[PDB]
Amino acid sequence: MLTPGNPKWERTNLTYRIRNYTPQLSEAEVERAIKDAFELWSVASPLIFTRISQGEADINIAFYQRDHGDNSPFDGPNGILAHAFQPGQGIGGDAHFDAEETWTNTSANYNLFLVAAHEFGHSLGLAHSSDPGALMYPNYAFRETSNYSLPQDDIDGIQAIYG
Ligand SMILES: O=C1CC=C(NS(=O)(=O)c2ccc(-c3ccccc3)cc2)CC1=O
């Protein structure tokens, strides 16, 4: 294909739900981080993300600690910050964030917006990139969060799947 293992969504309007929050940020700050992370992908693709407040969404977002029901346990502070599942029904698309992290909306470690943007790449069908400037690079690095600019390698990736 282009990246087998990873598939793709069959429709362009996807719903998301934030299931819980982190004490590290206000509820509004979490909502804004997640919304803007989706917007990054939306402005480079045909995808439209619609928030729901309750019920079943395509993409569930949640903060969990250690074992949390999906056979991929988190590991406490640092290390694994988050993970996400490839497009599909059920857990497909879902994104989990390690609740034991310091989550920020600054340059201090683990800016939630940046980590969420990376995870949502996985939720949409992207794998890791070898480009260190790419959001989809395997390791966390801070980058400026002032606008909705996706690095060009990530634009190439989402365009290759969805146009
Ligand atoms: O399935 C997984 C599980 C864990 C991964 N690593 S991570 O949670 O520690 C992580 C690494 C980098 C980022 C990131 C780096 C730079 C910009 C934005 C996000 C976010 C989370 C990556 C991954 O793909």
Ligand SMILES: [Ca+2]
């Ligand atoms: Ca961790």
Ligand SMILES: [Ca+2]
């Ligand atoms: Ca899902």
Ligand SMILES: [Zn+2]
């Ligand atoms: Zn999980």
Ligand SMILES: [Zn+2]
């Ligand atoms: Zn990743």
